[PDB]
Amino acid sequence: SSRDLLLKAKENGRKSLLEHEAKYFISSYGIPVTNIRLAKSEEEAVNFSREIGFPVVLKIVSPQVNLRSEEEVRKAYREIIENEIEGILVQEFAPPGVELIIGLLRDPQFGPTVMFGLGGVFVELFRDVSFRVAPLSEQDAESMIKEVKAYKLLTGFRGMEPVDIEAIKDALIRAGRIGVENEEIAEMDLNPVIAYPKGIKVVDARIILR
Amino acid sequence: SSRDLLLKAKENGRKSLLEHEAKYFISSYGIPVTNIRLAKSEEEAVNFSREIGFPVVLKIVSPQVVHKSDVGGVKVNLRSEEEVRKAYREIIENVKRNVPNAEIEGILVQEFAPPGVELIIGLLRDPQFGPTVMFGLGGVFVELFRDVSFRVAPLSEQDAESMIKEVKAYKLLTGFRGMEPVDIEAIKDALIRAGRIGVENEEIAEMDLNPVIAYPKGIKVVDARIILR
Amino acid sequence: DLERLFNPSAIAVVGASKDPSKIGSQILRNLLSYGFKGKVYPINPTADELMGLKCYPKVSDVPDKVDVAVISVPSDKVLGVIDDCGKAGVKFAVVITSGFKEVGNEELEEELVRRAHSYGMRVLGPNIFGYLYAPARLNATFGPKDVLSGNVAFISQSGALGIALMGYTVVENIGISSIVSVGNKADLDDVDLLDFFDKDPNTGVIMIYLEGIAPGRGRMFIDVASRVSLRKPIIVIKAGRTEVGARAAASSIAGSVAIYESAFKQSGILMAKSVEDAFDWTKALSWNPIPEGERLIVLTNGGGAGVQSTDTFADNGIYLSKPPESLIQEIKKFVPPFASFANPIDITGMAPDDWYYMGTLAALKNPDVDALTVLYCQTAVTTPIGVAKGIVDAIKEAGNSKPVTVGMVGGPEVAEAVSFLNKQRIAAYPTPERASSAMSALYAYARARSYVMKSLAV
Amino acid sequence: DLERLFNPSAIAVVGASKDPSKIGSQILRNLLSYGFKGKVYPINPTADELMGLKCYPKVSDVPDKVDVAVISVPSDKVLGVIDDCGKAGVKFAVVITSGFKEVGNEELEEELVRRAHSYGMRVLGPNIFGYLYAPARLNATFGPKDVLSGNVAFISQSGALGIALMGYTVVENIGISSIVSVGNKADLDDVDLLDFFDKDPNTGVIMIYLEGIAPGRGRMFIDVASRVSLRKPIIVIKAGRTEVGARAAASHTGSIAGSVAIYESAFKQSGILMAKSVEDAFDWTKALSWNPIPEGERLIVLTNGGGAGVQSTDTFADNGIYLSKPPESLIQEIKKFVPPFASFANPIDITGMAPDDWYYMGTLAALKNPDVDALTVLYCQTAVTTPIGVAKGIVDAIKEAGNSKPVTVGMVGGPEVAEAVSFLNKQRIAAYPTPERASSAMSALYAYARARSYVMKSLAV
Ligand code: NA
Ligand code: NA
């Protein structure tokens, strides 16, 4: 079970899932993610990087970029080490698109609640956000999407085609389900999420435990 | 007088000022613009390039041209005297055989504009209230969300300040991720002068300052459009 | 199950006295004057009789199964009375008495509830002004002695404003099925009451003054409110609907404004920002069916009111469309050539009284008309009461039930006419904006209903 | 200069008749019943006398200098009457008669104006229900015969709604200095009228129902309205303040839809308060009419219950008005009689146990306190009080306070509260049947203070 990830984290006295564990957990609920592998050795990092295809990104994995070949990656591995580790994350490249935030929080009154908004300044600065209490219906997901002021950024504008609204609705509904079913999850942040004319991809995921 | 530009355009039956003329006119009212020069010769294009500093952009200047890029009359990122001599002749040739019967006024040498926060400053004529100034943030914020404010000219300092703070995308001027606060005073100053242009020049039907770039210090109009009546 | 709370066979009043200024005494008085048909048992240590009724020293001494005990004794005596009521098998304890959680005595309040539950007894309040149920001729409050009879159930978390609004319903001609003060909500709350009013055939509309919901109660609130919304409109006046006000009402923790709003939307609930809006909407929803479609007609003897109406409807996402050609033909039988038919239909200020009858009738009968707002501006060529009578006659002869609101502008004669119409249970208001806002509420509810239906789809 | 329009020595009524159903006849009756002390000259071809007044066949025949001619003849006769009025030296032609630009006869209307001006004559209307000026006891309308006297000048571009609202001022206890129907605005308009009311000592507040202003008139409108705003609040009810409504209102006049956003900006630059509804307009007018502007932001709210106080807080917040802690001196005073579980966070909650006398003491203490700039008093009817008793307490407190600080009152309850609110409003104390309306009224006072400050800063040297 994917719940083994949560149990393992709890057993290790951790308050959060590591980056790769979070993506695995999100993936098992049917939410698409950028492909990743956890490298425990240089031989594994090279092995995995070549496996999923270039270019890849490397970042540290510990409770405490733009690589194209094994030759280039061998440098980055040691560079990252130099610049108490669980390992190094090898991440697939994410083509640019329209950025989204899908959140999950727990309200004292209403319990698990889903948050939606567009990325960059629109959430971070303008706080242009919508909320729906989980579990989410299709009607809940659609309406909360149409509700935000920056909605029009999803329906086509200068130099950007319309994105897959259905894919977004689908992810929102599944985010709600994660919150309803997993009591030990206090908070979840899918940010950034990239919307394309077809499908979406969670690039970064944060899950907090309680 | 800068009004000579308007009179000249009118006498030749033109309904708009050329790109460089619009900037000269805007500059004479004390509104900052990205630096430019009109080159009448290759040697002047080179001298002006050194004057304005690299990299520079070159464009054809002619009333008949409306889309310089399409006609092959825009050379970008010229960094050396040699590159400028090349671009100069490339443009003369390209336009001279893509719009053969063309009356060229010269070639425009334009300064590079460091990136920043984009603004829109407009001037229109409302049937009731006459010359009115429009303000908004650039990109999607005006084009898509239509987030704009209006003030009837002449503008006071209080008019300019309040109309700036009024727009929904105001926070983009006061500092956000990866961007320092910009010169609000410079923006107010430009808005007030835009209003003055509208009040004093009856023959100006419409003016569009777009894009305008705000920096932590000062602003710079990159492109200016002036329509006559 | 609150059947025995609203329809009890026997009610005890604890705290009544020879002193008519005591809260219990006021409650007892209201109970008798309002005509409660069950048994009333005043409870008092000494008095052998109060208001002609045999008095007892303790509820346990009452030779009868008491359903409801209305407790108005001092807080330091409440628990003692609870034990007695429990021993006596009382099912509901209505604790009028204040001085619990709202003054920082959380321990006393929790003890009150647990001790109540140990006997299988439910608690209303504490810190409340009581409750009223018209179908059972039950006025167990120390508020006004009377209310107009109707289908509106009003639940209030606030005391002073609640008891004042109780009186205000009379002035605004709102027919009441029930008034319930819930105060501290230590036990029985909005969820429980909504569950009862859902099943109540006497209640058609539910108005709630809500400060906040108890932690962990929100999901159930949405589940219950949604199903209720399918058949009965719910209007909520939210206390602390702004960030600043939310903190003020917290004097446990400031609840999320944005999440409360979303919760209301998912429940199909209409949020009113003011008492006036809440009452104006309640009136219309109480006296009209929901529009079965979007073809709304506005009728006016002047463009001015019609424009105010258009703007007001527009602010509510309601846009008027061209009237059916058949309706235009009907009206053209009597209206001048310089009349507008763009909707609003402007029959001009020259319109005499009878034109309001003919116009209203034509509109209501027309099969392609779903709702009607009738606007009137007083002029010397008309009488307000004549116009009102014409509208009444038109509605009756129409022989159908389509939503109607009325806006009348003018002097004292208009005030009288509006009052006449409202006493006919025809939603009438002294301005075009309020008439159109009221009609907007009807459409808001129709759309809210649709939201909930779609959200519950299989 | 409209001095002779509002204060004429002689008024002619053209179109009056023995038939009491005629418009001119209705106007003549109102003129006499309202008590005009100048001379009135009925004009009619045959009648030798109307309502006991010597009648003449033409204005030119009047042996007297006529200042104002009220014309209610058919449109095809109006021009003939204008020529006669010109010959007679009439300064103002008040053209009741409809059937001009609003029905597509722009040519007739322009000719009316042109021919008027050739005689040095100004035109009001056409297509209007007349005008009223209380200080001159002049009711030249066919509306209600009477209005309450006061300092509010009401200008209306609408006919039916205008004449109806005229009556509504009575029900809402609004004291009127003037009613002016401007209708088609062929000549005299809002600008001209604002100029007069600026100089009028009888007018303190100006309410305008405005559909639109003429092309090229906007700049002057802002110039005049801003300066007026420096001393007197202007409330505008804008017809067609939405995109959708603007188009509709362009048909009723025969014009093109002006820009909503630019009208809003113009109003801001003029210091004008825009009301979205008749109710808001009247509620604000009442408060502005009976109160001076707050000298500062230290607003106190008083209530016998947290519920009303929260509604008040929310409503004030929606208007960008935020309450702050009361002065300690005021808290001490109130603590002399208030229970221990009372809140002093502002709103000051004297609890539902508050008897009548506490409203007197609290109100008095607040108004007297030098660090209090304004007071909103909220009351919820309880068995412990009488609404009229509370109202009288507030009245006594305001009197004994011996100052003029802004006060609004919100009372909630049954018929007794309805009576109490009416009592207060007849005392020219702004009282409302809900806490939200009381607080919106108080908000209007602060809105005007801020608008006026805007204009001042805008005019800085
Ligand atoms: Na020129
Ligand atoms: Na007579």
Automatic annotation (TrEMBL), chain A:
Protein name: ATP-grasp domain-containing protein
Residue ranges of every copy of the ATP-grasp domain listed in the record: 23-59
Alphabetized Pfam families for the sequence: ATP-grasp_5
Residues that, per the record, bind Mg(2+): D204
Organism: Korarchaeum cryptofilum (strain OPF8)
InterPro entries listed in its UniProt record: Acyl-CoA_Synth/Transferase, ATP-grasp, ATP_grasp_subdomain_1
Coiled-coil features, chain-numbered ranges: 67-86
Taxonomy, superkingdom: Archaea
Binding residues for Ca(2+): N191, D204
Key words of the record: ATP-binding, Calcium, Coiled coil, Ligase, Metal-binding, Nucleotide-binding
Binding site for ADP: K59, E92, A94, R206
PROSITE patterns, alphabetized: ATP_GRASP
GO terms of molecular function: ATP binding; ligase activity; metal ion binding
Automatic annotation (TrEMBL), chain B:
Annotated positions binding Ca(2+): N210, D223
Keyword entries, A-Z: ATP-binding, Calcium, Coiled coil, Ligase, Metal-binding, Nucleotide-binding
Membrane found in the keyword field: no
Annotated ADP binding sites: K59, K68, S69, E111, A113, R225
Residue ranges of every copy of the ATP-grasp domain listed in the record: 23-59
GO molecular function, one term: ATP binding
Annotated SUPFAM superfamilies: Glutathione synthetase ATP-binding domain-like
Residue ranges of coiled coil: 78-105
Residues noted as binding Mg(2+) in the record, renumbered to the chain: D223
One Pfam family of this chain: ATP-grasp_5
Entry protein name: ATP-grasp domain-containing protein
The species this protein was found in: Korarchaeum cryptofilum (strain OPF8)
UniProtKB/TrEMBL annotation, chain D:
Keyword annotations from UniProtKB, A to Z: Metal-binding, Nucleotide-binding
Keyword Metal-binding among UniProt keywords: yes
Chain positions recorded as ADP binding sites: N127, Q157, S158, G159, A160, H252, G306, G307
Binding site for acetyl-CoA: S17, K22, N44, S98
Annotated residues for binding of Mg(2+) 1: D64
Binding annotation for Mg(2+) 2: E211, H252
Domain named CoA-binding: residues: 5-100
Gene Ontology molecular-function annotations: acetate-CoA ligase (ADP-forming) activity; metal ion binding; nucleotide binding; protein-lysine-acetyltransferase activity
Pfam families in the record: CoA_binding_2 (PF13380), Ligase_CoA_2 (PF19045), Succ_CoA_lig (PF13607)
Residues the entry annotates as binding CoA: S17, K22, N44, I96, S98, I128
Annotated signal sequence range: none
Domain of life per record: Archaea
Alphabetized InterPro entries for the sequence: CoA-bd, Ligase_CoA_dom, NAD(P)-bd_dom_sf, Succ_CoA_lig_flav_dom, Succinyl-CoA_synth-like
Residues annotated to bind Mg(2+) 3: H252, D349
Keyword match S-adenosyl-L-methionine: no
Protein name: Acyl-CoA synthetase (NDP forming)
Protein's organism: Korarchaeum cryptofilum (strain OPF8)
